[PDB]
Structure formats: C-alpha cells, structure tokens
Amino acid sequence: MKVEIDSFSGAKIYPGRGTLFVRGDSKIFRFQNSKSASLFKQRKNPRRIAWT
Amino acid sequence: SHRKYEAPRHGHLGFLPRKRAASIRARVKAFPKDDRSKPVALTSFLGYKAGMTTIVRDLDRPGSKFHKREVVEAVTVVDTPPVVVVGVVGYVETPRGLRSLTTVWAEHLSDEVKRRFYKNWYKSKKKAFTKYSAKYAQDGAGIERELARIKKYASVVRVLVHTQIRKTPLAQKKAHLAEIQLNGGSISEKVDWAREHFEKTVAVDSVFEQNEMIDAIAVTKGHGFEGVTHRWGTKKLPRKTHRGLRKVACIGACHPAHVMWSVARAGQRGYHSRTSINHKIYRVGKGDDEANGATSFDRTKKTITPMGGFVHYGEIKNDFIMVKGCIPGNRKRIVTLRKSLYTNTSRKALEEVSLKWIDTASKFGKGRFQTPAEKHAFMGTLKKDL
Amino acid sequence: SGNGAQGTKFRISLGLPVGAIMNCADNSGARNLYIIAVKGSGSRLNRLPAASLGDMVMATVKKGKPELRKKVMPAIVVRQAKSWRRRDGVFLYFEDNAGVIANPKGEMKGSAITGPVGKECADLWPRVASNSGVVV
RNA sequence: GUGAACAGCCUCUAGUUGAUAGAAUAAUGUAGAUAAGGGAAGUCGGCAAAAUAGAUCCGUAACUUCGGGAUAAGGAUUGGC
RNA sequence: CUCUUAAGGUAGCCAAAUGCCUCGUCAUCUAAUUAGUGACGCGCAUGAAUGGAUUAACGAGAUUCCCACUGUCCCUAUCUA
RNA sequence: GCAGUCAAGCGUUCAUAGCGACAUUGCUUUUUGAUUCUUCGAUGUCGGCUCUUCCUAUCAUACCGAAGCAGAAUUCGGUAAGCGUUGGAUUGUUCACCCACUAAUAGGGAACGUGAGCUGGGUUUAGACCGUCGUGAGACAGGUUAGUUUUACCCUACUGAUGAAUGUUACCGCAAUAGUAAUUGAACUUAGUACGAGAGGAACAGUUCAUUCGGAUAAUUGGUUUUUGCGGCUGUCUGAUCAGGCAUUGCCGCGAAGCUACCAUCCGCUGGAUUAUGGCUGAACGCCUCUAAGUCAGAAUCCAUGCUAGAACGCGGUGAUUUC
Ligand SMILES: [Mg+2]
Ligand SMILES: [Mg+2]
Ligand SMILES: [Mg+2]
Ligand SMILES: [Mg+2]
Ligand SMILES: [Mg+2]
Ligand SMILES: [Mg+2]
Ligand SMILES: [Mg+2]
Ligand SMILES: [Mg+2]
Ligand SMILES: [Mg+2]
Ligand SMILES: [Mg+2]
Ligand SMILES: [Mg+2]
Ligand SMILES: [Mg+2]
Ligand SMILES: [Mg+2]
Ligand SMILES: [Mg+2]
Ligand SMILES: [Mg+2]
Ligand SMILES: [Mg+2]
Ligand SMILES: [Mg+2]
Ligand SMILES: [Mg+2]
Ligand SMILES: [Mg+2]
Ligand SMILES: [Mg+2]
Ligand SMILES: [Mg+2]
Ligand SMILES: [Mg+2]
Ligand SMILES: [Mg+2]
Ligand SMILES: [Mg+2]
Ligand SMILES: [Mg+2]
Ligand SMILES: [Mg+2]
Ligand SMILES: [Mg+2]
Ligand SMILES: [Mg+2]
Ligand SMILES: [Mg+2]
Ligand SMILES: [Mg+2]
Ligand SMILES: [Mg+2]
Ligand SMILES: [Mg+2]
Ligand SMILES: [Mg+2]
Ligand SMILES: [Mg+2]
Ligand SMILES: [Mg+2]
Ligand SMILES: [Mg+2]
Ligand SMILES: [Mg+2]
Ligand SMILES: [Mg+2]
Ligand SMILES: [Mg+2]
Ligand SMILES: [Mg+2]
Ligand SMILES: [Mg+2]
Ligand SMILES: [Mg+2]
Ligand SMILES: [Mg+2]
Ligand SMILES: [Mg+2]
Ligand SMILES: [Mg+2]
Ligand SMILES: [Mg+2]
Ligand SMILES: [Mg+2]
Ligand SMILES: [Mg+2]
Ligand SMILES: [Mg+2]
Ligand SMILES: [Mg+2]
Ligand SMILES: [Mg+2]
Ligand SMILES: [Mg+2]
Ligand SMILES: [Mg+2]
Ligand SMILES: [Mg+2]
Ligand SMILES: [Mg+2]
Ligand SMILES: [Mg+2]
Ligand SMILES: [Mg+2]
Ligand SMILES: [Mg+2]
Ligand SMILES: [Mg+2]
Ligand SMILES: [Mg+2]
Ligand SMILES: [Mg+2]
Ligand SMILES: [Mg+2]
Ligand SMILES: [Mg+2]
Ligand SMILES: [Mg+2]
Ligand SMILES: [Mg+2]
Ligand SMILES: [Mg+2]
Ligand SMILES: [Mg+2]
Ligand SMILES: [Mg+2]
Ligand SMILES: [Mg+2]
Ligand SMILES: [Mg+2]
Ligand SMILES: [Mg+2]
Ligand SMILES: [Mg+2]
Ligand SMILES: [Mg+2]
Ligand SMILES: [Mg+2]
Ligand SMILES: [Mg+2]
Ligand SMILES: [Mg+2]
8 A cells, every 4th residue: 555745745645635636748646635736726836835 | 287207205204203313322123133052242332433534455356346456445433442231131022022021230330320320410319229239138039039030031131231431532421321132042041141240341352353244323413403405305496486495395285285294394404313234344443452553564553543533532542343434423422333133145244354554644634644753754853842 | 338338337426417518539530529418327307417437428529520510429538527536545537528439339430549548438448448548 | 095086995183883682503594605527408588696807018800871890809918126 | 355443562671570371491500499590482461751671880678699607507515694 | 088899801821919890888087078066355377496195097127928929129918106207409388399318218196286385488457569450449369579476473284392290200121003215227247158041149146336216424535614723915094113903704825623515435134925927736527627625836016024203191120219
C-alpha cells in the first residue's frame, strides 16, 4: 500500500485521502486536500507558498 | 383518474410509525436458534460506538476485477469493554407466549448497575438490592430454590449483564443493563453457566471472532420534527408554488374522504430502532494491546485511537469490535451487537480478511500524519520542543 | 456500459446526463459528441439518463464533418470530468469529457484516440484499448 | 473624503437612538446567499436566477432615409511605489 | 362569347395577426419540430388612404433560433435575518 | 369498447395451431348519446405538476399448459395486480405524432382523483387587430394579442407529540393487534455446445457486476460557512503607529465542526403451505381414467421467520418503599 506525495504541497497522501487529477497531456496530479488542489487551480506557485 | 405516469411510492411502509423510539437502548427482538450441543455462550453484546475510520486490505474474491488487489474500506469501531453477569431470567412457553417465571440476581451489584435503578442517585439512600443480598445469608436456599426452578420449568435462559461504562470515555456514570440469551447446551447447563459467572466478567472475544458477520441493533440518530421532503424523499415542488414547496401537492383524492395512512406527512425524523444485518468483523480489539492499530504489514506500535482522539467520543482503552462499513446510531450511543440469525454462505461472508493498514490520522480535520512520531520526523524541530 | 462489451463495469459516478456535449477524441473528423441516450440506463420519473466513463451512448455530432452530422451514432466515453471513486479508494477525474464514435459492436469508426483513456473504459472495450494512447 | 457626480459608501455641524419585550432556533415560510458534474434535458414560454458592466487603447458586419446601425461584435489593459 | 348585379381583383402580397380543409406541399433548422424561417398559391373568405407593397431607426409589444449564463431541471443539500 | 355460441370458409393438405363469414347470446360504464332526478340565497373549466390508493379486460417480471413448438424467435391460453411500466422534439392541449432508451415502455378508477396544493398556457368579462356576416349597434361552435387565482387559528381525518386514573416509584421483559420489501437487467461460464443441410443458435448449476426501490450512515471525496477561524482588498473614520469601527454578514482566498449527495459509503433474512399445471395409486364402469375417496411435485402467491410500533382501560419477572 503506497503513500504518494501531494504534487504541490509535498504532503503525505495516505490511501483514500485527497484527490487525483489527470491533465490534458497526461501528466497525473495529486492533492491531499481541497486546499492544495484549490491553490493549484488558481495557479499559485508552490515555491511562493510558505508552508510548502 | 389514474396517475399520468407511474412512479414508485416514497418510503417503506414497514418502518412505521415514524415516531421516536421508546428506549434509547434498542431491543433485540430475536436471538439465533439455539444449538444446545455447543458450549454455553452469550449471543449478543453491549458496546458504545466510538467513531469510524479507514482500512486497507487485499481482496479475496476470485473472478473480480479487484481480486488479489488492494481495496480501501470505511469501518466503524465500537468501544466494547467486558460485560458483567449480574443475574438470570427463566422463560416459559405458554399459549400466550414466552413468560418471565423468576429472576435470580447476584449478591453484589456495583454502583454502575445500582445507578440504573435510580433517577436521583445522589440524594437516594442507595437501598437498591440490600434486602435481596440477605437471601445469600442462608447457606443457599432461597437463591438455590429459584435456581432450581428455572432448571425445571424454563424453556429459554437469559443472563442479565451490564456495561462497565466507567471504562469508557462517556460522562454517563449510569450503566446499561441488558438480557442476553444463553445458547449453550442443556437448560441445566445454562443456569449453571449463569450462576458460575455471577458478578464475574465476559469479554467479546468469547462471542465474536474475525470474519464473522454480525447484526447491529440500535436507535438511529435523531433530527426532531422534519418536513416531508427530507423525511420521505418526496419531490420538491416548483419554485412558483405559493405557500412553500417542501410539502406534497396532493394529500389525497376526494374519496376516501380522509387523509390516508400512507401519504407522506411532516413530523419526526430520526431516533428510530433499526436491526441492521450482515456486518462483517474486521478486527477484534484487545484492550491490553499496545498494537491495536497495527498490522502484520504495518508493524509500527500504535493503538486504534486516532490522533487527536475519536472526535466527540474520546479514546479506546478497551477491547473493541471493528465492523465493516457502518452501523445505526451515532457516536456515544449504546449498541447491542448480535450474532447472525442464519448461516450465511455469501462468499462475501466466508471471506477471511486480513487488514494491511489502519488509518489512524486525526478526524478533527484534514489529518496528515499517523503517529506523533511521524509528525516530528516530517516537520522537524519546532519553536517549542527541546 | 451498453453492450458489444467484454466484461462488467463497477459503478462509477454519473457525470454526463442527456444534453451533455463531450469532446470527440478520435480522428473521425467529428469535433463534438452530443448525448441523447445511454444504453445502460434504467428509469425513474424525471431522471435524465446520464452517463459515465466507458458507457456507450447514442449521440449526434454537432460540429465537424458534414457527412457525420444530422444522424445518431453510438459513442463511447473515454474521459469524464465528474469525480468518481475507484475501489482502491481514490477519487480521480479528467479535464474534459471526451468520447469516441463506435458501431453497435463497439468497433471504433476511427483509429486514433487523442488524450488519455480511463482503464474502466478500456477494459470494457478491447478496441478502445487497442487505439488508446495512454490509459489512466 | 472617495468619485464624472446633488450616485452609492464613510464622516462634521444639528437631530434622533422612536417603532412591546424575554427565552429558544422544530417543520413550513418571507427576505438574503452558495452549490460538485451537466447546462434549459425544467416550462405555455429561460418565468426566476445567473452572466455582462467603469475607464484607456485597439478594433468593429449586413443594411441604411447617409443622419445611423455602434458602447455593434471582438480584444488588451487597470494596485502600490 | 355569354349571365347575374354596375364592374369583374390590375400593381402588388400570402397558409400572412386575413387559409376552412390544415399539423397544407417543397426546402431548411433538429436525434425527433401541431413550432420558426424560405418558398409555392384556383387565395373557404389576400388586395390598393375601407389604403396595397416596401422600408432604415425606434419598442417593458407577439414570435423563432444562436453564443454567453446559469439550482429552471437531473437532485437536491447548507447557511443568515 | 370487450367477450362468447354455431361452424361456411382462411389456413399447400386439414373447420377450430392461429383466425373466422351469415347469423346469434352477452358484458362494460375511462366513448358518444338519451334522460332531466339532485344542486341556480351561486363559487368554475381544460391540461399539467405533485402524491396516494384501488380495478384487471396483463405490457414486463415468476411458474406453467398449446402450436402449422427442430433451434432461436414468436404466438395462444392458465395461476397471477407480488413488482415495475421511463427520457425527449412540435402542440395550452387530453389526444396525436416522431426521436430514443428499455425487462416492459399495459388499459382504467378514486366528484371526467387531486386550484383555502400549485400553475394559468387554453377556454370564457371588460382593451385591441384581421377575416367572414350585418345598413348598423354588433355577431362568429374563425385567426390573434393583453388581461388581480382570497381565508383555516374551528371539527374530523392524517402525521408526529404530552398525559390524569387503577398503593407509590424503578428496572427487565412478553406479544395480542396493525404495518411490512425488495426489484429487475447484463456479462463470464455452460458453449459456438444442445438442435439444425445451412443460416444460425439456447438453458439450468457456478462466478462477477449492474438497474429500480429501500434503511442507515459521514472514515473518505464533494457541497454549505456568522467558526465572522486565519489571511488578502477597496472606501471612510479613530492626528500617525499599533489595533479597530462603519459599508443591513462590505468584497475575495482558504476554512475545521455540524449538516449533508447514487456527488459519498455501508446493509437489505429463509422456512413452510398452496395456485396453475404435471403426476401417483384408484373406482365409478371386472376396461379405461390425475379424482370421485386418498396422495406426490409445485409460482414474483399466501402464512410464518425476520423487520417497525406495542394495546396509553392487554399481561409477566424483579428492586426499593417515608418521622419529621
Ligand atoms: Mg471540504
Ligand atoms: Mg389523471
Ligand atoms: Mg397506471
Ligand atoms: Mg411498520
Ligand atoms: Mg424536509
Ligand atoms: Mg437519504
Ligand atoms: Mg404565484
Ligand atoms: Mg403536503
Ligand atoms: Mg412533493
Ligand atoms: Mg457505521
Ligand atoms: Mg472530520
Ligand atoms: Mg417530468
Ligand atoms: Mg429528415
Ligand atoms: Mg446641493
Ligand atoms: Mg445606509
Ligand atoms: Mg425635529
Ligand atoms: Mg408595530
Ligand atoms: Mg451546479
Ligand atoms: Mg457550457
Ligand atoms: Mg417536458
Ligand atoms: Mg412544456
Ligand atoms: Mg422543451
Ligand atoms: Mg427575466
Ligand atoms: Mg458564479
Ligand atoms: Mg503597473
Ligand atoms: Mg339586370
Ligand atoms: Mg382591373
Ligand atoms: Mg395598373
Ligand atoms: Mg394565402
Ligand atoms: Mg398564422
Ligand atoms: Mg410562411
Ligand atoms: Mg423550440
Ligand atoms: Mg381605390
Ligand atoms: Mg374605400
Ligand atoms: Mg426595449
Ligand atoms: Mg445560485
Ligand atoms: Mg433551493
Ligand atoms: Mg379448407
Ligand atoms: Mg389441421
Ligand atoms: Mg330537475
Ligand atoms: Mg345533467
Ligand atoms: Mg348550495
Ligand atoms: Mg384474472
Ligand atoms: Mg401440421
Ligand atoms: Mg422455425
Ligand atoms: Mg434468432
Ligand atoms: Mg418468428
Ligand atoms: Mg382469443
Ligand atoms: Mg396494488
Ligand atoms: Mg413519452
Ligand atoms: Mg430509459
Ligand atoms: Mg367516469
Ligand atoms: Mg376533475
Ligand atoms: Mg381540493
Ligand atoms: Mg385558488
Ligand atoms: Mg390565461
Ligand atoms: Mg376580451
Ligand atoms: Mg390569450
Ligand atoms: Mg401586459
Ligand atoms: Mg394551513
Ligand atoms: Mg393523533
Ligand atoms: Mg399483507
Ligand atoms: Mg465462446
Ligand atoms: Mg431444416
Ligand atoms: Mg489615535
Ligand atoms: Mg512601525
Ligand atoms: Mg459611526
Ligand atoms: Mg440509496
Ligand atoms: Mg391434481
Ligand atoms: Mg380427490
Ligand atoms: Mg368421478
Ligand atoms: Mg421473493
Ligand atoms: Mg428482514
Ligand atoms: Mg412494551
Ligand atoms: Mg402498554
Ligand atoms: Mg404475558
């Protein structure tokens, strides 16, 4: 049973948690919650988000 | 003149009346059919639901797209500390039904139980079973006499037991008392088992084992007075409708000139008794165990209690039943847990399960870490600490 | 699903009711796929038939090759934007809803699928999996 | 003061603080909001709601009584220092 | 050429807010259209200040469609006073 | 509108597998008429919406009997209303019609169910245009447009909710009566098998999913946000700062908790007795016969198991019962 990383916050996604998103080309994305996903969706830059 | 289109009725007519249940402790209305050739043992159990959480496991279902594959599953953990036999009841078949013949109580009943028999315990003389305890003064006799009676006339035997509510997080000091049917052998062998256990204790690993389907009797969460839309799943009227739209448009035809017992009306939703069946046992908790929450795959030393504690409940100091999926009633409420009334060969019911991991994150928020250990390792040393 | 299919689809959340327009990911020359029906579906008063990944729908091309419009064809859903939960406990979703034309057997009218395809859609239709780019 | 402004919002002088009151927050309401995916499939009918919106620059169709159409449409921009 | 009754519907226009039959025929729009539009016209019972035809601009007028938008709906949930 | 009796014919042959002419007996009251009994000190109508229940002349589903039943498909009939019977384009429509899905898209009742439940598109007051009629005012079972939809706090009903009196009070139970629930499809496999010249082409048993319904539930994901929890922003006001006010919750981003979604996840029991029908032994009738006596198998049926209430005038087992 794996544990993935948030592809924004770099947090730990345990089974069943968060959400998965499959962009246009085919790159797969992962968010541990509605927070990192919302930031990604606004196109924030993680390198600017303090807690990342 | 015939409804223009067909649709099914709303609501089930066999869960009527939709009122508030009597007790908050739901009744067991049936016990499994006794096979009087197996050892004596309880047939149901008292416990307090704590909360839910997530599981992982491989699947064992040959022919499924997910056979030999990990699945995640919601589970609910009910806080189930050992129960205490304080008495026995003798039931006799009659042409008017079962009948309680006598009841024989134990010599020393704790305050937990004693409490139940009172409405203002603090200002009471606590005279509860004081003159009954005198029956034990004699060599035996009066108690031995009534014990002999059940052996002669009773056709079914139930033990009285009660929760040790104090072992749990709850503010309630008063313990819940329940009858449970003895399904071991001979009627004689029964009351014997019962006398032998007076004042003594019984745990849940003596009733339920893993992979067992069990049923779960309980009183549903309450919601007070409800409109017909959410209470019945009635359709929501158009927006233009004068006088609101969470109603139903036609309470009835002209004849019968009477609102009928089957059309949907506003009123109580929730606090109903439900017997919910075929819940499979995923893990039987050992209280003494420091590895409640661990696995043969994830070996880290942790218990079942989630980080931050079970929300609105507390911690699990005790033995617990992990059941698959969900259970009626809400956190803190008592739940009778009962063996199946039948021998299911569902395959879904014969599957032996072994968990791979047990989500132990906080539920009070979007939990990231499983153990305080892990939080540290990941975030590093903070401004407090050291 | 529908039929012409190999296997069973576990339930996934519906995301495409009738009236939905989803992208055409093949090379048939059809830019649209407008849904008018869902071969799997059942029936409730006022319930729009809605579709999900790897179902087969009846459809009409509303943009693209003249020789391809003003007629109903079958189509298959390869991507949906509505989040669904797989049995491994994960809630994924794609960026658009996309579909591919097919005959009642399931045999695609084109030979290429631009974009990714859902595994469920692929396991259900060999021929979608054949011409697929990436799956999941 | 903001601002095109006798607009809206905030203030000074002056004037009121007057419209029975207390405790709770069931249903159903009246008034105000928000909704994943789809996007009028609802309905007599987009009714109701939503969306657009200032300003600077660019850009701008058929037709026309040559005056219009026209803020047609379609775009970029906008703080602080 | 004739009859009633003085003439005998010209220029135009139309299933038109005027057409019974009628959901007219043909074309178009649509998966499908008693709808809309373009046409056709022996037009029950169109028609020339009892004004006919045309028409840019204008319209809280009747009507059809497209893009946008959307809890109108699928299918309901939650919050405030 | 629906069903019969007769049996000339249809049906390659053959009345009756499936039909059925001449005639003839009936049934129904969702057609339309006939009537004018009831209601003119009155209270709308059509359609839809919503919702419940009933009918059975059954469309689907269960089990059967028939066939011009090889198989598949269909068709006729029996027990059968247990359970479903849909999404849409044009129309005010009911109706009609077309697209499409589907196991099937059955027909009807309940004041042509249902307006102090809605809606108000149609019809059918007053405004207005056209056509026909009329000298005209005006008319039309013609076209068109615009046209205010009142009251429940009473009684009963229904849904939920307290409650006096059976020494007092408390705990644990019984179960009369009433309710009651599941539904349907597909794939794999059987099997390219049975059957069939071929074309084609099944089923049980087994496995995996799904549709419709239902009861819960909130770990997860999603929705909600006065947590006015944290941050951001405009305007103004408190001399500045810091920190705040006001803008009927000022606006934006996140946002725990609670509530909550086939937008989420879990769960939805198994014994008997029968129906139709097929039979068993077996007379009547020394034969024959499923039937007369007796008897076997036997359905989405029924009765239980199970599930919800628990009679506030149905009951049982048990605890404690006052000096101030
Ligand atoms: Mg959230
Ligand atoms: Mg009706
Ligand atoms: Mg019906
Ligand atoms: Mg009931
Ligand atoms: Mg409600
Ligand atoms: Mg619900
Ligand atoms: Mg209104
Ligand atoms: Mg109502
Ligand atoms: Mg309703
Ligand atoms: Mg539970
Ligand atoms: Mg939580
Ligand atoms: Mg409808
Ligand atoms: Mg055509
Ligand atoms: Mg002035
Ligand atoms: Mg003001
Ligand atoms: Mg004054
Ligand atoms: Mg007043
Ligand atoms: Mg939405
Ligand atoms: Mg769109
Ligand atoms: Mg409609
Ligand atoms: Mg309509
Ligand atoms: Mg429409
Ligand atoms: Mg409007
Ligand atoms: Mg918006
Ligand atoms: Mg700049
Ligand atoms: Mg003359
Ligand atoms: Mg002339
Ligand atoms: Mg001339
Ligand atoms: Mg004409
Ligand atoms: Mg017209
Ligand atoms: Mg025309
Ligand atoms: Mg239209
Ligand atoms: Mg003239
Ligand atoms: Mg004149
Ligand atoms: Mg205007
Ligand atoms: Mg909204
Ligand atoms: Mg609403
Ligand atoms: Mg013949
Ligand atoms: Mg013959
Ligand atoms: Mg009369
Ligand atoms: Mg009459
Ligand atoms: Mg009267
Ligand atoms: Mg019958
Ligand atoms: Mg023959
Ligand atoms: Mg044949
Ligand atoms: Mg065939
Ligand atoms: Mg045939
Ligand atoms: Mg017949
Ligand atoms: Mg019925
Ligand atoms: Mg229809
Ligand atoms: Mg359908
Ligand atoms: Mg009638
Ligand atoms: Mg009526
Ligand atoms: Mg009424
Ligand atoms: Mg009214
Ligand atoms: Mg009207
Ligand atoms: Mg008028
Ligand atoms: Mg009108
Ligand atoms: Mg008006
Ligand atoms: Mg009322
Ligand atoms: Mg009552
Ligand atoms: Mg019944
Ligand atoms: Mg094969
Ligand atoms: Mg042959
Ligand atoms: Mg200061
Ligand atoms: Mg400073
Ligand atoms: Mg002030
Ligand atoms: Mg459900
Ligand atoms: Mg028989
Ligand atoms: Mg007999
Ligand atoms: Mg006989
Ligand atoms: Mg059944
Ligand atoms: Mg049950
Ligand atoms: Mg009781
Ligand atoms: Mg009672
Ligand atoms: Mg009794």
